[PDB]
Design a protein around this ligand. Structure first.
Ligand SMILES: Cc1cc2nc3c(=O)[nH]c(=O)nc-3n(C[C@H](O)[C@H](O)[C@H](O)COP(=O)(O)OP(=O)(O)OC[C@H]3O[C@@H](n4cnc5c(N)ncnc54)[C@H](O)[C@@H]3O)c2cc1C
Ligand SMILES: Cc1cc2nc3c(=O)[nH]c(=O)nc-3n(C[C@H](O)[C@H](O)[C@H](O)COP(=O)(O)OP(=O)(O)OC[C@H]3O[C@@H](n4cnc5c(N)ncnc54)[C@H](O)[C@@H]3O)c2cc1C
Ligand SMILES: CCC/C=C/C/C=C/CCCCCCCC(=O)O[C@H](COC(=O)CCCCCCCCCCCCCC)COP(=O)(O)OCCN
Ligand SMILES: CCC/C=C/C/C=C/CCCCCCCC(=O)O[C@H](COC(=O)CCCCCCCCCCCCCC)COP(=O)(O)OCCN
Ligand SMILES: NC(=O)c1cccnc1
Ligand SMILES: NC(=O)c1cccnc1
Lengths: 425, 425
């Protein structure tokens, strides 16, 4: 038996397991899959033999992600400032302007007014209290209705919608307007910052940092799927698909939120948390890497397409590249290459699709979902609590961060606080 | 004797005198000078024989100035959309960009945040209550300190300051930050709108509308300076520099605010109003028409010069134009043509000054000031009341508008309410 069992080896689990270990605890780390990193997946392209692609979470911004910045600085991990955009091909109607910020002057007075409204509403949210504890229900409505109340003229209406589609991974009518605001608050009460935090990338991918952190964890078991976590006894008992149980004083659940319903907890979890855990969160972000000929470097496209955003990802050859599309999985079928062609040609009619590459996070039983985004109504009923301790069992990870939900910095933050919790118990 | 005496024949006096007359009152209009229009002065250029220039208030914007729009529509007065700007020559440092909106992206996140602060503060002001009745003292401080608290990066700091200098007619340390906000509220809670209301001009100058309105006033006396307004008796007694008094049930003071201290009121005015009336308001706007060779059409310059703004006014010849500078009278001496050359060359080094043209509103005893702007501290002590009736004597005009101070629309608004007041008495 162990001081702690860390269940899940994404960034959250890895930090906790490392920090407890360095603090002198006897820690075991249990990972269901055959790799470490979780939703930070860097592998080789399915399209381009020999090329390494980020299939999940890639970007960072130091001023917003100090914890991540410290990890990179600790292990000397190189980051490069992300591909600049020299070329704009929006689908925002004829009055829009082909630059990074495509709102035209004719819309400025409306943008000014909406900027005040968006920021006033976001200033409502205090990021330490939980979205259920601040009388924020009037905000917890479908985003399409929220944006309809703002009454924005065409370019900015659709610019806001397209980036809200990309970032939330939900179509406008499934997204919570209050979650959109939670992101604005996360970024220092900035709308712009939600998009400008696409600031840096790992020169050699997330795997660098995954490896540096795991180097410092002495006991890791891959292919070890947890199926029950039982704290009826004096000492927590962790049960597993094929194998002898493991036992520890503390357990940290560092697995996706949408997977918790596949573990048997004993006793059953506090009763507030239970419907949300069953239904899961609404996140459906679909990120597609598209292999293309005919595209020049630097293209960014935002607009009303089934891909709200489509932009450069990297150079493949002198005539070939990868672009990246965002849309959501219950709106687009990534295996319908003709669909993909139509979505792309919509913005970029000169460009031939050579192939596509994605991960079905939803279909993956180790995840059942990409990054968190609540269903309308969920997080103003229960939110802070989904990541509070239940007995000797802690809950951590991006999904349950109040400070940064959906980003690595969130995975790292939630583990700080759990590690600290345990160190005092 | 008359139902009403209207004292002053700027736009405020002219509307009142006309509306009372049309309502069937026996009205006399008394004007101290030799022309009608007041601070709306259109005469011939001192520089360009035969050319008609606006020396005072020229611009309008229909959506913000419905009363003005109705006057223009009533008399079929043509307006032309004001000279467009094709050419930018700012002095905002090396990171600024030569277009109408010169803030660079590097400053966007700061602009966003200040936009929220500026608009939150302006939303504090409710335009019907008066600036002294809303607990707004924390705002009634020097603008330089306010803008220092906002902590803006160079381009936008100086862009805001330069336009606040132009619009308020005061250097930053003499201007009330709360007045700056009053203007933002006046324009529908818009910062941008304060500058975008430079939208239209009178094709043939303000005089058109001055003449249409005066056509409908049957009794006007020019060169008739009022020196005492005495309402001790049953009927108000109006005394005059050289001449027999005039008498009326009602008197409307439609003269500048900074002139009221040159009239003897009986009884003396309510005691709150009296210090402000003595000291006067702080407005020192100085608008200079500059006759130039070497300038092309379309130039707008904003920057840190002794002229915060310098831009095209109109074509004189194919090689000659007028520009317009704004600055303030206690900072620049318009008769120092070398000073003017330096101020201009600062922004426009290729341009030769041929001459200048201005009106000393301050030195003019019929005005003693250009448009209103309070001294720091004044309008959060007394404001609404300066334009409330004192006995049978009413007070109207741009200076005392809560809705639009410094614009014609304000002169027109304050006269509506006085005319209505009288019609019910
Ligand atoms: C498409 C996409 C793009 C993204 N882009 C960014 C970005 O640009 N910047 C950024 O900061 N973040 C980004 N992210 C979000 C971020 O990468 C993740 O939210 C973050 O890595 C979450 O890590 P975690 O440690 O909380 O959980 P995860 O990384 O998901 O780790 C959970 C671990 O638990 C394991 N597991 C699951 N079930 C069991 C079981 N029962 N027993 C044992 N182990 C189990 C899984 O195999 C996994 O290793 C992106 C995410 C996605 C999906
Ligand atoms: C440089 C400058 C630029 C401007 N630009 C604009 C603009 O772009 N758009 C806009 O809407 N407004 C503008 N204005 C402001 C606007 O023109 C004035 O505030 C407005 O016309 C005020 O009119 P009024 O009727 O309130 O007073 P005034 O027009 O000033 O009229 C007062 C009248 O009283 C007379 N008078 C004074 N003393 C006596 C006396 N004791 N007895 C009898 N008569 C007396 C004066 O001769 C005058 O006719 C500008 C003003 C200035 C100074
Ligand atoms: C009382 C003092 C008042 C201070 C005045 C400050 C601001 C005055 C700015 C005046 C000019 C604005 C015109 C827009 C430019 C344009 O026409 O050309 C535009 C450029 O405009 C834009 O890019 C849109 C900008 C959106 C910004 C929203 C503003 C929120 C904050 C306002 C800034 C606050 C200032 C400092 C804090 C290009 O598209 P078009 O050519 O195809 O069309
Ligand atoms: C959660 C969903 C979030 C929705 C995202 C919406 C906004 C994302 C915008 C992303 C791009 C911004 C980059 C700035 C452009 C640039 O680099 O290039 C800039 C252009 O930027 C500017 O002109 C300054 C704009 C100032 C605007 C202040 C914004 C207040 C409101 C924000 C808009 C709200 C959106 C709709 C309501 C040119 O100067 P540079 O090239 O010499 O330098
Ligand atoms: N939570 C988010 O909005 C998010 C994070 C990373 C990538 N895309 C979206
Ligand atoms: N009150 C004002 O700011 C004003 C009005 C007209 C011209 N300049 C300034």
């Amino acid at each position: 038996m162990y001081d702690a069992i860390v269940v899940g080896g994404g960034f959250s689990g890895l930090k906790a397991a490392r920090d407890l270990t360095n603090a002198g605890k006897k820690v075991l780390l249990l990972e269901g899959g055959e790799r470490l990193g979780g939703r930070a997946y860097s592998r080789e392209s399915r399209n381009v033999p020999g090329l390494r692609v980020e299939i999940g979470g890639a970007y960072l911004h130091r001023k917003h992600h100090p914890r991540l910045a410290a990890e990179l600085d600790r292990y000397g991990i190189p980051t490069a400032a992300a591909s600049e955009f020299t070329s704009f091909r929006h689908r925002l109607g004829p009055t829009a302007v082909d630059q990074a910020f495509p709102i035209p002057g004719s819309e400025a007075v409306a943008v000014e007014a909406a900027t005040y409204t968006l920021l006033r509403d976001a200033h409502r949210i205090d990021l330490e209290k939980g979205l259920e504890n601040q009388d924020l229900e009037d905000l917890d409505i479908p985003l399409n209705e929220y944006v309809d109340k703002l009454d924005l003229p065409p370019v900015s209406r659709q610019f806001l919608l397209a980036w809200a589609w990309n970032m939330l991974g939900q179509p406008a009518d499934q997204a919570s307007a209050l979650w959109m605001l939670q992101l604005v608050a996360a970024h220092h009460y900035s709308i712009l910052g939600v998009v400008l935090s696409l600031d840096e990338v790992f020169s050699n991918g997330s795997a660098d940092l995954v490896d540096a952190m795991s180097q410092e964890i002495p006991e890791i078991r891959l292919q070890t799927v947890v199926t029950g976590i039982d704290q009826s006894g004096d000492v927590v008992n962790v049960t597993v698909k094929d194998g002898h149980a493991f036992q520890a004083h503390s357990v940290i659940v560092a697995t996706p939120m949408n997977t918790w319903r596949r573990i048997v907890f004993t006793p059953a979890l506090p009763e507030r948390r239970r419907s949300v855990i069953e239904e899961g969160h609404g996140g459906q972000g679909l990120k597609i890497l598209i292999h293309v000929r005919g595209a020049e470097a630097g293209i960014e496209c935002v607009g009303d397409g089934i891909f709200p955003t489509l932009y450069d990802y990297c150079e493949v050859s002198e005539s070939e590249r990868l672009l990246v599309a965002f849309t959501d999985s219950g709106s687009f079928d990534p295996t319908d290459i003709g669909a993909v062609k139509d979505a792309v040609l919509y913005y970029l009619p000169e460009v031939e699709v050579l192939g596509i590459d994605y991960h079905d996070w939803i279909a993956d039983p180790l995840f059942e979902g990409p990054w968190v985004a609540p269903r309308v109504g969920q997080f103003s009923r229960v939110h802070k609590e989904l990541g509070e301790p239940a007995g000797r069992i802690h809950f951590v990870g991006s999904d349950v961060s109040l400070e940064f939900p959906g980003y690595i910095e969130g995975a790292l933050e939630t583990a700080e606080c759990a590690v600290n919790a345990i160190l005092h118990s």
